[PDB]
């Protein structure tokens, strides 16, 4: 709690900020690609379906 | 929907414009030859009949 050696609350705020940064990066990729499924990591089944479809 | 990668509506407008261009080409052909069936592609039975009678 009142420790100089560590502070858990900063670690939790860091986890929250990293979650926000990851969601922002995903939104950046969806904007710059124009696809919600741009590659196999987005969704492998729908991606393979679209590959055979195209 | 609101995609940048593709749009159905221009495709539908294009197939409609292509149908209009095809009808205009058929009209130009009927105008410049003066016959509703100028060749075997127009109507094979009527064309065979008219050619044997001619």
UniProtKB/Swiss-Prot annotation, chains A, B:
Cellular localization per UniProt: Secreted; Bacterial flagellum
Binding partners and assembly: In C.crescentus, the flagellar filament is composed of multiple flagellins of 29 kDa; 27 kDa and 25 kDa.
Function summary: Flagellin is the subunit protein which polymerizes to form the filaments of bacterial flagella.
Family: Belongs to the bacterial flagellin family.
Name of protein: Flagellin FljL
Organism of this sequence: Caulobacter vibrioides (strain ATCC 19089 / CIP 103742 / CB 15)
Lineage: Bacteria, Pseudomonadati, Pseudomonadota, Alphaproteobacteria, Caulobacterales
């Amino acid at each position: 709690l009142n420790s100089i050696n560590t502070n858990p609350g900063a670690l939790l705020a860091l986890q929250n900020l990293n979650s926000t940064n990851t969601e922002l990066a995903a939104t950046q990729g969806r904007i710059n690609t124009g696809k919600k499924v741009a590659n196999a990591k987005d969704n492998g089944a729908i991606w393979s379906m679209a590959k055979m479809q195209s």
